[PDB]
Amino acid sequence: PPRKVLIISAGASHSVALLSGDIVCSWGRGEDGQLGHGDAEDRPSPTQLSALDGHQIVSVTCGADHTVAYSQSGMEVYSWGWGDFGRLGHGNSSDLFTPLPIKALHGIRIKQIACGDSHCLAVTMEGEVQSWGRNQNGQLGLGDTEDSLVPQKIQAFEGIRIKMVAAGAEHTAAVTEDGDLYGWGWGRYGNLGLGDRTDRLVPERVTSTGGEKMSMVACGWRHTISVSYSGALYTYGWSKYGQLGHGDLEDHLIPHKLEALSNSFISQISGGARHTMALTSDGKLYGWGWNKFGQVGVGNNLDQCSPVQVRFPDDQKVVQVSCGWRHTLAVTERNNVFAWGRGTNGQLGIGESVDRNFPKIIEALSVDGGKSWVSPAERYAVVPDE
């Protein structure tokens, strides 16, 4: 009996999953250390991350070229991969090819980790938020633009219990337990939801939410998605690739409700670099946005500016979805895992280096059918040899 897949996460060019028995596996691009196997090799099939066996890992999250995992029992957070700007949180900017504990987070009750492209945030059980990494557009919410190589508390949230956060390329969004929506960081293309093009160095409340309380949020390179207590889905930011999903390519500087999904109750959302996924209460998966590599999953390579249901064998319901930069992963009710989109580095996990534009089952995970440092000269600027 295959282990149940508990968590899937997609990065820029890699994929990570957590299986029952707290087994972590990882696949796709490995040249930056993001797979955590102690080498710089790509992996075309899901590969067990042995260094975390027995650590009671309960959560995994992909950034772009880095990965974070944490253990609630061990009260330990681990990070690895590309380390520039302090995104790994260890007080330096060094690459890591094996997981290392984030010492600053030891013994802290962590409820969630969000990984932007070059910054990370942790939400505690008490609803506080700590952030680290790149801060050039204020995306750490610390009130400056200095990068932080270690986690730092967002003081602006004191007295405000945070339910969850999400991180894009250079911006961050959050929802409170009370249902308030917040945005900060890079705001040039409207993706903060505040009505202007100005960045924010601290969290700023979205004052125009249609009068609804927001339950969830997710981010991409230039867009943001939120879901209301009613189950209504809102998108905002840039839509050159149709990632806002409103039928046009128009900008939106404030949250804009996606009318074509008012039929449905949205239970989960995920944001890719330029595409978007929404999971209904029924287990229907809708995707839209950038589709050059097939990452919308609807059988072609044309961008989609309106939601299109992603189809699965026997219409099995989807229970989890995760977008990367250029690929998408999903878990179904039958404990099957599917992947689609760009696969050049093996990140679809089907033993290939090819793109796919409709969902493809990851046989290794589905019921149905070592060194901390690698010298850059072995993994960068290597002349092709033959």
Next chain:
Amino acid sequence: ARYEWDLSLSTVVSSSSSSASDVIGAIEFDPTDNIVATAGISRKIRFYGLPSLLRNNAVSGTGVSFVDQATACEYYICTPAKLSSLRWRPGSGGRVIGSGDYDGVVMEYDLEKRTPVFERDEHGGRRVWSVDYTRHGGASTVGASGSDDGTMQVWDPRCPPEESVGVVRPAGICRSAVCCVEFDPSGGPAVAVGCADRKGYVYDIRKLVDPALTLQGHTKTVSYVRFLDGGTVVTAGTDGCLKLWSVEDGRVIRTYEGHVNNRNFVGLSVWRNGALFGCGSENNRVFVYDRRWGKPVWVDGFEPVGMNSGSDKRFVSSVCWRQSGVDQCTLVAGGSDGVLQVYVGKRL
């Protein structure tokens, strides 16, 4: 063998601050030769105003000037992927710079707005090793990219990026990687490529269907090709040598040896006015050859403070001459640790 140049280390740019890997894979001058752009593993295109860098940080006598990165770097652009290559786009007045990267993507950035203006992803996600543009074309300029997918593709940066003005697969059946692409800098029709089938090729950009000139003699991958003039090109191979070739008959004129290069891209730049060839070396050296002799005329071995430690053998990973020099030359070298080494030369 004549030693005609007093070429000396003037300036070293280094970072106190960051432990991130910072191999420099590309170094290029803008069309005025006032600006140097660098890029590599660290996903940052950095820009330096070179005359002002040297003038504002000068030291007394013959000493070397050491400048911190934060002081030296005017600004930089964060990119989504590791960079293999850079080239300023002619005819844009120094406003646009192109890059190739490890995601197989060619980007163009407008430096007046600091925004991306061109994005092309047509190599199947296979790494782009090299980018260049035709010279003296004005409005007819075209770009080209060479990639691990075994193609050189030619594209018009004014058209939709999905389009293509031409595509060649020089290595043929095995589809070996195209590691370098270079247009004739004087504006003639030749475009040279270097491939992992151990050969270079010279095509006619006006008519890519016409049979290529084959440059055969290397025993390993051709990592670089650069023009000396309309009639000659220089290749580098990971057989540890450079080779000078006649574009008219494809014969090897001379082979240049002495440096160490069996694995990495270490840079190749040809100072056309001086007929001097510069390259890096895997034993942490910068080499300069004169066209006339197969033995190097000059080597430098700068070692940054604290290099000895660490088990990582530092090497010189990129070089670039200032082409407009005639009576003065300038050679910029980039280390596998992100350190820049600026050499200035006058006749002896």
